[PDB]
Ligand binder design. Structure first.
Ligand code: N5N
Ligand code: NAG
Ligand code: NA
Ligand code: NA
Lengths: 250, 10, 27
């Protein structure tokens, strides 16, 4: 996260770290949506142009964390994956359309003060909250700058940007399964996700029922925190039927 | 710079 | 079900340091 601040303890208890077994490294963010399902970006797992193709056994999820590098004994829970499900129409060739994957944990994780699932939006929540100018929140242990790394989880609040402005900032073909967020160059505030934040949650807090909803997944962007560029996020609600299909069937 | 995690997970 | 209600914040009626900024944006 660029131009964010340190998270408070327990501020984002659905935050999940995707951690490579060997070598030991941070791969991506992710989020906890129930006691045994984790949501992330498909490109965190499968991206053939960089020869990336991770299987269940290559990865661990670390849940309840705050410090980036410490083993947070008695606080974090580390889980193994049973199965990864990538959206069948994930488009890694052209524009990262439908950049979404589910991961099923080998065993349910117990909830605690530091580990708690985020809600998925229904149609009504998406309709009322996904509006230009409304702010959501991105969290992650990714780089602090495009060209170093944070000691603890970082947080930044960012406004959703109007679709035409998103479209005109890039040569990539934007779809209905994406939205963009960030400040405009004239707005005098900054902030963005960066390398290592991918797959993490873009959340909003409903003013109707006071719950947090995951509206987005950190997907892509050109550099980090560049003027006139915006972060792109997978539109979780547009892909919810696939989510429900996988969870119901498996 | 990652601290080692318990052996069983690796 | 209990989703999206944080044990250290919503469940205790405590607010985090910047959540008001989100709420103030929801016009
Ligand atoms: N600044 C933000 N918010 N982001 C997200 C987190 C990582 C941040 C930094 N990451 C990057 O700059 C690299 C790249 N940007 S790109 O312009 O090269 C690009 C963009 C879109 C593409 C679409 C299809 C194919 C190839 C694409 C290539 C990018 O965002 N990617 C996703 C990722 O990094 O996890 C890489 C997989 C291509 C950027
Ligand atoms: C990725 O890995 C899986 C499991 O080995 C393999 O079946 C699949 O063909 C690979 N996909 C690509 C695009 O390489
Ligand atoms: Na364009
Ligand atoms: Na920008």
């Amino acid at each position: 996260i660029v131009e964010g601040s340190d998270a408070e303890i327990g501020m984002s208890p659905w935050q999940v770290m995707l951690f490579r077994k060997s070598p030991q490294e941070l791969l991506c963010g992710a989020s906890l949506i129930s006691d045994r399902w984790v949501l992330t970006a498909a490109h965190c797992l499968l991206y053939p142009p960089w020869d990336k193709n991770f299987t269940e056994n290559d990865l661990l999820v670390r849940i309840g964390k705050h410090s980036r590098t410490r083993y947070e004994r008695n606080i974090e829970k580390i889980s193994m994956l049973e199965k990864i499900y990538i959206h069948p129409r994930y488009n890694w060739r052209e524009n990262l359309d439908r950049d979404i994957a589910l991961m099923k944990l080998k065993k349910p994780v117990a909830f605690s003060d530091y580990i708690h699932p985020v809600c998925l939006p229904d149609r009504e929540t998406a309709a009322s909250l996904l509006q230009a100018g409304y702010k959501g929140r991105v969290t992650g242990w990714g780089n602090l700058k495009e060209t170093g790394q944070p000691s603890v989880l970082q947080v930044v609040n960012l406004p959703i940007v109007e679709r035409p402005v998103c479209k005109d900032s890039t040569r990539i073909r934007i779809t209905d399964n994406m939205f963009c967020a960030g400040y405009k160059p004239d707005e005098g505030k900054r902030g963005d996700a960066c390398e290592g934040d991918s797959g993490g949650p873009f959340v909003m807090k409903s003013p109707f029922n006071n719950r947090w909803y995951q509206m987005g997944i950190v997907s892509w962007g050109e550099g980090c925190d560049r003027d006139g560029k915006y972060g792109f996020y997978t539109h979780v609600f547009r892909l919810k039927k696939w989510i429900q299909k996988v969870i119901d069937q498996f | 710079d990652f601290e080692e995690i318990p052996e069983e997970y690796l | 079900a209990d989703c999206g209600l944080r044990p250290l914040f919503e469940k205790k009626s405590l607010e985090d340091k910047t959540e008001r900024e989100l709420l103030e944006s929801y016009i």
